[PDB]
Structure 1
Amino acid sequence: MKTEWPELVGKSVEEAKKVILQDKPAAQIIVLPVGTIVTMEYAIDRVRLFVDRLDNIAQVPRVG
């Protein structure tokens, strides 16, 4: 079971969503700015995508 997507760093947020939904169709994807502080609960269904100001992925997406 794939739970991290390091190959998505530097891709567009669009491609990241498409790829993650192929691997994990029920994923609850939330897009947030990189460099923010976030809650520290672990939600197995969630994948946060942290984006830079250009809307490219700036951190390795993972489940949680």
Structure 2
Amino acid sequence: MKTEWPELVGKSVEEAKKVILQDKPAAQIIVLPVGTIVTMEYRIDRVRLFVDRLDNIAQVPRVG
């Protein structure tokens, strides 16, 4: 079971969403700016994507 996507860092947010949904079709994807503070609950269905100001992935996406 793929739960992290280090290969997506530096890709566009669009490509990241597409790839994650191929691997985990039921994923609840939320996009947030990198360098924000977020809640620390663990949701096995969620994948947060942290983007830079260019909308590229700036942190390894993972489930949680």
TM-score of the alignment, normalized to the shorter chain, above 0.5: yes
**Over 6 Å off, 4+ runs:** none
Unaligned runs of 5+ in 1: none
Number of residue pairs matched? Answer: 64
1:33 Cα deviation after fit: 0.1
Unaligned runs of 5+ in 2: none
1:6 Cα deviation after fit: 0.1
* TM-score, normalising length: structure 1: 1.00
- Secondary structure class of the residue paired with 1:58: coil
1:58 Cα deviation after fit: 0.1
% identity of equivalent residues: 98
Deviations 1:10-55, CA, capped at 9 Å, x for gaps: 0000000000000000000000000000000000000000000000
Give me the whole-angstrom Cα distance separating, in 2, the residues matched to 1:7 and 1:54: 18
Give me the whole-angstrom Cα distance separating, in 2, the residues matched to 1:46 and 1:33: 16
Give me the whole-angstrom Cα distance separating, in 1, the residues matched to 2:29 and 2:60: 14
